[PDB]
Amino acid sequence: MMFHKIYIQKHDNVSILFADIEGFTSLASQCTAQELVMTLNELFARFDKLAAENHCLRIKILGDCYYCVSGLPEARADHAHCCVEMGMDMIEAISLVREMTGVNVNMRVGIHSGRVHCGVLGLRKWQFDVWSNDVTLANHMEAGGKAGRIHITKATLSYLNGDYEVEPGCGGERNAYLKEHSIETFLIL
Amino acid sequence: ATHRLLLLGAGESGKSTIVKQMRILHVGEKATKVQDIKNNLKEAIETIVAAMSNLVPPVELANPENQFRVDYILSVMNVPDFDFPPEFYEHAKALWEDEGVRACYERSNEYQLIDCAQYFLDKIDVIKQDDYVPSDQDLLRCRVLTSGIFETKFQVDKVNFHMFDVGGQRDERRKWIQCFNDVTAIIFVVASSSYNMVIREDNQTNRLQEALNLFKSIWNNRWLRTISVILFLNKQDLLAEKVLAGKSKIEDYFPEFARYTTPEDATPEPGEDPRVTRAKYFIRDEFLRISTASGDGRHYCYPHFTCAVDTENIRRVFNDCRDIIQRML
Amino acid sequence: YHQSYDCVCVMFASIPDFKEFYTESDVNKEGLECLRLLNEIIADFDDLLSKPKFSGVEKIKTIGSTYMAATGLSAIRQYMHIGTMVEFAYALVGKLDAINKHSFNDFKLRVGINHGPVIAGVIGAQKPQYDIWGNTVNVASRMDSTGVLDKIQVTEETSLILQTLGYTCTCRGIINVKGKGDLKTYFVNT
Ligand SMILES: Nc1nc2c(ncn2[C@@H]2O[C@H](COP(=O)(O)OP(=O)(O)OP(O)(O)=S)[C@@H](O)[C@H]2O)c(=O)[nH]1
Ligand SMILES: C=C[C@@]1(C)CC(=O)[C@]2(O)[C@@]3(C)[C@@H](O)CCC(C)(C)[C@@H]3[C@H](O)[C@H](OC(C)=O)[C@@]2(C)O1
Ligand SMILES: Nc1ncnc2c1ncn2[C@H]1C[C@H](OP(=O)(O)O)[C@@H](CO)O1
Ligand SMILES: [Cl-]
Ligand SMILES: [Mg+2]
Ligand SMILES: [Mg+2]
């Protein structure tokens, strides 16, 4: 055959959560490389367990960027709630690791819902991943979020069926992508 | 049974016209295309006029009165929303009858002029009417640049066809890849008559030569090793006209033409001049040399002499295409 | 179990123009056709690892359309692995040029390289994914994010080592890097 076999499949109605350490390059620039990894392993191990409880499938860790999706592998109509509950658990977890370790770790959380393409790429070192405009947007919501709070889109609010009290996010004034694409954001209480 | 056909070729080769013929043949909006037709008219007249003073040597007007009409056309050239007053058509028609303007037109291969130039300028009195209705042939000549990919769906004897149209200009070629996977066959279109012209993208590369390089890239592509190519040697009507006119020699652009004699398997049309037969078969062979050099058994090339604007020639050739696709593909 | 290292050369290689090329329409199957092309590119890159001259290169992962790799993970003559990484970057450029020739595109690579101590291992409870951490890795990523098309940007210390090996370098200047402040960087010559 002409092209290599592609191991990717499309999935509608899913939710993507992104979490990122604030000022990571600054943080890792201070303490030893040993201490940093202990702080991260302590943090991401808990997240990985909370992911199983909240029905979320973790994707990967990009140093300080943690992200997962809900509604995979098997479709779930309860998706958006899982990611919100998952983000909630993360914020408390970061708080404990801030307490028992003493390190100033703070994360921003962004969430969005839509369609994704998931699978693997290349021939070597396969690592399950997701790609799509919706995944790209979800990523920007994190960049445009606020320290220690969950930032969601209007598309994610419509899947939440009104179970969470939110306030105007104003994500448009903290990230040029969200503004340019006219996205209404919200912050969960 | 669903066949996905991908149209490829350089810019202004005839891809969008082929799609139009499928719509007329195998598948109201005419009022919307009137504006596009008047634009083609305005573009043709202003281009021929703007070139008069830049040629070497320059072409002079045969009538001094027309100097004012030239001044008129140039003053409205860049006007965004032109309302097309009755005066405009009077000036264009006047200019197109001037022998000097006509001489500049005979040297159009020296600048960039759209193919529908003479067709529309010859019927200004028809287009100018407020009650004017575009004929089938008018919509086939109307030129509008293609940007992006367009899918047209039709059915012939309960057999499905999905045809993809793509921009042929250089910057547009980067989109083709999105149609490579699972393509039934490729239809490569070429402007057989553009041997004495240069492309628009740089104003230096010979048009036919660009097609040849583009075909070689397609035929030898790593993702199309088992994909057959139906080759449309388009613009047969302009080729014959150019060949017979004797002003622009083929061997002065492609030296190899001087060592070329017509093949045995040659099947000339009834009444066709030997010179025309010799030229069209030469252009086919330059393309066959490339297809012959590689692939060997994995995929084949099927040539066809065509004239996109001639609905009759297209029905005949697309039928021959239906035969090729079913015999194996 | 984790492990500490002293001199690992990390490289981040991006394709800045890819994001623009990617589009979701009904014709390209909601962006699936674009992803197919990314698959070909990552695959052509992946097989350079089979070349004997590249035995010491370890692919770490792909970040979107960015390729991440490292050398010196086989350790623990002294500095040749840093030079092998630069040779690997040149190879990728040749793989991407081949891709452009067939897909009618003009993608260009943007590279960032640095070296120093790192930590290798797995992290988290979900899966056994090998990765590397450290300030060395963070800086390498910045040498990419603040780089130039068709250029390999390296740090001052990496520049010195490349010179003892026979490479020429041009000073890019002093740029204020997010989280690090003012850093003096360099471009490898060709
Ligand atoms: N006389 C004549 N004119 C033709 C023929 N085929 C196409 N044309 C004219 O040439 C012009 C260009 O053809 P068109 O189909 O628009 O090109 P294209 O290949 O789609 O071009 P592009 O979109 O890549 S930039 C049109 O005005 C069309 O009517 C032909 O066989 N004979
Ligand atoms: C394939 C292209 C496209 C558009 C697909 C996509 O969703 C991404 O892969 C994400 C968002 C997505 O895969 C999630 C991980 C990460 C690392 C955040 C990606 C990068 O930002 C990619 O862009 C870069 C900059 O490499 C981006 C945006 O590229
Ligand atoms: N192992 C790694 N894998 C991927 N990205 C990494 C790794 N280590 C560091 N980075 C990224 C994280 C930072 O980007 P952000 O996540 O902060 O956007 C950047 C500089 O620290 O390098
Ligand atoms: Cl052509
Ligand atoms: Mg960060
Ligand atoms: Mg067209």
Side-chain angles (χ1 to χ4, degrees), chain B residues 249-252 254-261 275 278-280 282-283 286:
Chain B
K249 282 298 191 304
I250 291 190
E251 76 282 342
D252 289 348
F254 293 80
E256 52 269 40
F257 188 66
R259 292 285 181 270
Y260 188 79
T261 63
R275 288 167 291 182
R278 194 186 162 227
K280 73 184 196 174
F282 165 61
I283 288 172
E286 297 266 75

Short mmCIF file of all heavy atoms in Angstrom, two decimals, chain B residues 249-252 254-261 275 278-280 282-283 286:
data_model
loop_
_atom_site.label_atom_id
_atom_site.label_comp_id
_atom_site.label_asym_id
_atom_site.label_seq_id
_atom_site.Cartn_x
_atom_site.Cartn_y
_atom_site.Cartn_z
N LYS B 249 6.02 29.06 -34.20
CA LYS B 249 6.57 27.72 -34.42
C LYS B 249 6.83 26.88 -33.16
O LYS B 249 7.45 27.35 -32.20
CB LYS B 249 7.85 27.82 -35.25
CG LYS B 249 7.61 28.04 -36.72
CD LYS B 249 6.84 26.87 -37.32
CE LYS B 249 6.81 26.94 -38.83
NZ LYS B 249 6.24 28.23 -39.32
N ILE B 250 6.38 25.63 -33.18
CA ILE B 250 6.59 24.75 -32.05
C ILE B 250 8.06 24.43 -31.80
O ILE B 250 8.51 24.40 -30.66
CB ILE B 250 5.78 23.43 -32.18
CG1 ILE B 250 4.28 23.72 -32.04
CG2 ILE B 250 6.22 22.41 -31.13
CD1 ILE B 250 3.44 22.49 -31.92
N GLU B 251 8.82 24.22 -32.88
CA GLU B 251 10.23 23.90 -32.71
C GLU B 251 11.10 25.03 -32.17
O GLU B 251 12.26 24.83 -31.85
CB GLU B 251 10.84 23.27 -33.98
CG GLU B 251 11.15 24.24 -35.11
CD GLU B 251 9.92 24.63 -35.90
OE1 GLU B 251 8.89 23.92 -35.81
OE2 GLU B 251 9.99 25.65 -36.63
N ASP B 252 10.53 26.23 -32.04
CA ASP B 252 11.29 27.36 -31.49
C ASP B 252 11.15 27.41 -29.98
O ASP B 252 11.67 28.31 -29.34
CB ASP B 252 10.86 28.68 -32.12
CG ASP B 252 11.30 28.84 -33.57
OD1 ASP B 252 12.14 28.03 -34.05
OD2 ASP B 252 10.82 29.78 -34.24
N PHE B 254 10.44 23.98 -28.31
CA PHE B 254 10.82 22.61 -28.01
C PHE B 254 11.57 22.08 -29.24
O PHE B 254 10.97 21.52 -30.15
CB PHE B 254 9.59 21.76 -27.70
CG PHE B 254 8.88 22.14 -26.43
CD1 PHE B 254 8.02 23.23 -26.40
CD2 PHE B 254 9.08 21.42 -25.26
CE1 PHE B 254 7.37 23.59 -25.23
CE2 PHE B 254 8.43 21.77 -24.08
CZ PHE B 254 7.57 22.86 -24.07
N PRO B 255 12.90 22.28 -29.28
CA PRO B 255 13.81 21.90 -30.36
C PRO B 255 13.63 20.49 -30.88
O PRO B 255 13.79 20.25 -32.08
CB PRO B 255 15.18 22.05 -29.70
CG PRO B 255 14.96 23.20 -28.78
CD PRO B 255 13.66 22.82 -28.14
N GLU B 256 13.30 19.57 -29.98
CA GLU B 256 13.09 18.17 -30.32
C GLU B 256 12.00 17.93 -31.37
O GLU B 256 11.96 16.87 -31.99
CB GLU B 256 12.84 17.33 -29.07
CG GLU B 256 11.75 17.84 -28.13
CD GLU B 256 12.26 18.78 -27.02
OE1 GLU B 256 13.15 19.62 -27.29
OE2 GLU B 256 11.75 18.67 -25.88
N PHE B 257 11.13 18.92 -31.56
CA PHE B 257 10.05 18.80 -32.54
C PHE B 257 10.59 18.63 -33.95
O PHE B 257 9.97 17.94 -34.76
CB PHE B 257 9.12 20.02 -32.48
CG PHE B 257 7.89 19.87 -33.33
CD1 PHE B 257 6.93 18.91 -33.03
CD2 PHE B 257 7.68 20.70 -34.43
CE1 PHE B 257 5.78 18.76 -33.81
CE2 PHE B 257 6.54 20.56 -35.23
CZ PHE B 257 5.59 19.59 -34.92
N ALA B 258 11.76 19.20 -34.24
CA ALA B 258 12.36 19.10 -35.57
C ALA B 258 12.82 17.68 -35.98
O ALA B 258 13.02 17.42 -37.17
CB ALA B 258 13.49 20.11 -35.73
N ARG B 259 12.98 16.78 -35.01
CA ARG B 259 13.40 15.40 -35.27
C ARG B 259 12.21 14.45 -35.19
O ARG B 259 12.37 13.23 -35.27
CB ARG B 259 14.42 14.94 -34.22
CG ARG B 259 15.77 15.62 -34.26
CD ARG B 259 16.61 15.10 -35.41
NE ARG B 259 17.93 15.74 -35.42
CZ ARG B 259 18.21 16.86 -36.08
NH1 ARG B 259 17.28 17.47 -36.80
NH2 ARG B 259 19.43 17.38 -36.00
N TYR B 260 11.01 15.01 -35.04
CA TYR B 260 9.79 14.23 -34.89
C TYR B 260 8.93 14.01 -36.13
O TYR B 260 8.57 14.97 -36.83
CB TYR B 260 8.94 14.85 -33.78
CG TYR B 260 7.73 14.03 -33.39
CD1 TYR B 260 7.86 12.92 -32.56
CD2 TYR B 260 6.46 14.35 -33.87
CE1 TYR B 260 6.76 12.15 -32.22
CE2 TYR B 260 5.35 13.59 -33.54
CZ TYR B 260 5.51 12.49 -32.71
OH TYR B 260 4.42 11.73 -32.38
N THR B 261 8.58 12.75 -36.38
CA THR B 261 7.71 12.37 -37.50
C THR B 261 6.49 11.65 -36.89
O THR B 261 6.60 11.03 -35.83
CB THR B 261 8.42 11.46 -38.54
OG1 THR B 261 8.81 10.22 -37.93
CG2 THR B 261 9.65 12.15 -39.11
N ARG B 275 -0.18 18.63 -40.48
CA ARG B 275 0.58 19.47 -39.56
C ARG B 275 -0.02 19.42 -38.16
O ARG B 275 0.70 19.36 -37.16
CB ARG B 275 0.63 20.90 -40.06
CG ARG B 275 1.53 21.10 -41.25
CD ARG B 275 1.30 22.45 -41.88
NE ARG B 275 -0.01 22.53 -42.52
CZ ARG B 275 -0.46 23.59 -43.18
NH1 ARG B 275 0.29 24.68 -43.28
NH2 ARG B 275 -1.65 23.55 -43.77
N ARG B 278 0.68 16.03 -36.60
CA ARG B 278 2.06 15.96 -36.18
C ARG B 278 2.30 16.67 -34.84
O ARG B 278 3.04 16.17 -33.99
CB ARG B 278 2.95 16.52 -37.29
CG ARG B 278 4.41 16.21 -37.11
CD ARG B 278 5.24 16.91 -38.15
NE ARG B 278 6.63 16.97 -37.74
CZ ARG B 278 7.38 18.07 -37.78
NH1 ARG B 278 6.87 19.21 -38.24
NH2 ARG B 278 8.62 18.03 -37.34
N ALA B 279 1.66 17.82 -34.64
CA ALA B 279 1.82 18.59 -33.41
C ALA B 279 1.12 17.98 -32.18
O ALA B 279 1.70 17.92 -31.09
CB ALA B 279 1.33 20.02 -33.63
N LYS B 280 -0.11 17.54 -32.36
CA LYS B 280 -0.84 16.97 -31.24
C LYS B 280 -0.24 15.65 -30.77
O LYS B 280 -0.17 15.40 -29.57
CB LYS B 280 -2.34 16.87 -31.52
CG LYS B 280 -2.76 15.79 -32.50
CD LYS B 280 -4.25 15.90 -32.74
CE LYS B 280 -4.83 14.65 -33.37
NZ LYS B 280 -6.32 14.75 -33.45
N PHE B 282 2.90 14.84 -31.05
CA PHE B 282 4.20 15.16 -30.48
C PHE B 282 4.03 15.48 -29.00
O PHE B 282 4.75 14.96 -28.15
CB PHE B 282 4.81 16.37 -31.21
CG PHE B 282 5.96 17.00 -30.49
CD1 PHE B 282 7.12 16.27 -30.24
CD2 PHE B 282 5.88 18.32 -30.04
CE1 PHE B 282 8.19 16.85 -29.56
CE2 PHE B 282 6.94 18.91 -29.36
CZ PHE B 282 8.11 18.18 -29.12
N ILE B 283 3.06 16.34 -28.69
CA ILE B 283 2.77 16.72 -27.31
C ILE B 283 2.34 15.52 -26.48
O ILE B 283 2.64 15.46 -25.28
CB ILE B 283 1.72 17.85 -27.25
CG1 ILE B 283 2.35 19.16 -27.72
CG2 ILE B 283 1.13 17.99 -25.85
CD1 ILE B 283 1.37 20.27 -27.88
N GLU B 286 5.67 13.41 -25.63
CA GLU B 286 6.55 13.99 -24.61
C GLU B 286 6.03 13.52 -23.25
O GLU B 286 6.80 13.25 -22.34
CB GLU B 286 6.55 15.51 -24.70
CG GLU B 286 7.10 16.07 -26.01
CD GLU B 286 8.58 16.41 -25.95
OE1 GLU B 286 9.41 15.48 -25.97
OE2 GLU B 286 8.91 17.61 -25.89
#
